[PDB]
Amino acid sequence: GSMSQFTCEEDFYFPWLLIIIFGIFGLTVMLFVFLFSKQQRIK
Amino acid sequence: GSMSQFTCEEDFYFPWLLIIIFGIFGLTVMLFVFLFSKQQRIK
Numbered sequence: 001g002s003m004s005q006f007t008c009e010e011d012f013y014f015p016w017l018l019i020i021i022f023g024i025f026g027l028t029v030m031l032f033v034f035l036f037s038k039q040q041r042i043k
Numbered sequence: 044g045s046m047s048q049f050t051c052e053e054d055f056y057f058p059w060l061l062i063i064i065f066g067i068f069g070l071t072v073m074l075f076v077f078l079f080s081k082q083q084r085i086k
Contacts, residue, residue: 022065022066022069023065025072026065026069026072029068029069029072
């Protein structure tokens with residue numbers, strides 16, 4: 001009633017860290033290939 | 044309906060589906076680079 005505060009139900013139970021790691025991996029893979037193609041470098 | 048099922052007719056993007064797609068992406072990216080290197084390594 002006085003202050004407003006919320007809380008997560010999952011409480012960091014499920015493997016969220018695993019998802020994060022994988023997420024960056026995919027984004028990095030594509031992001032790398034994209035920038036690499038623009039650089040026009042074989043090495 | 045106690046249990047639940049997912050079908051194409053439903054026409055709805057589930058959360059688990061997103062994980063699956065990404066999963067194969069990462070595995071394919073590495074699996075591809077690995078096989079690619081082996082294809083060049085040997086004449």
